[PDB]
Amino acid sequence: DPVKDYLKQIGKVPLLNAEQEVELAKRIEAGLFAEDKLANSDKLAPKLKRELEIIAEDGRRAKNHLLEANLRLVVSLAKRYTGRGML
DNA sequence: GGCGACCCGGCGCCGCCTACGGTCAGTACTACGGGTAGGGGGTATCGGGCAACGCGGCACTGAACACCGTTGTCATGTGCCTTG
């Protein structure tokens, strides 16, 4: 029962291709640099800090895009490795 | 619109003790890295075997006194003989 609901929760999400995934990774590194700059104790402009924060949030969104995409692969591997004592 | 069915869920039960019962289940890997409980030797502290040194009864060096016992001792008193 619950696994059916989790597979439903996976539902339909956009699968990832080479161009989409590499663009997402580019946004990820952009956001990582943005939060790096934010974490620096040096004073930064307020609007600049908000720009860095929003790109970091967009990178987080990209992260969840990758994870929600590859839930299907990880459950495939789980099927490969299940039935040996753990749930 | 509340009844009504019906439909389903949902549970809940189905009686009391007694002898023994036979077994087995599939698809990573290396690699490092720390860090240890175990292997060692050497040292400080506590835990055993022979004498220790008390006591006590009495016992003796008997010594030195004490307790009767004794024959020492004797200046001093009766009895006979000689003279007033």
Residue A40 in 3-state DSSP? Answer: coil
Residue with tokens 């700059």: A37
Find and list the nucleotides of strand B having atoms within 7 Å of a protein beta carbon. Answer: 26-27
Please list every residue in chain A followed by a chain break, i.e. its C lies more than 2.5 Å from the next written N: none
Q: Give how far Cα A52 sits from Cα of A4, A10, A12, A15, Å.
A: 39, 30, 31, 27
A85 CB below 7 A from strand B atoms: no
The nucleotide closest to A81 (CA, C1' atoms): B27
Overall resolution, Å: 3.7
How determined?
A: cryo-EM
Residues A54-65, buried b or exposed e (16+ Cβ, 10 A)? ebbebbeebeeb
The token pair that represents A40 in the structure block: 């620096």
A83 CB below 7 A from strand B atoms: yes
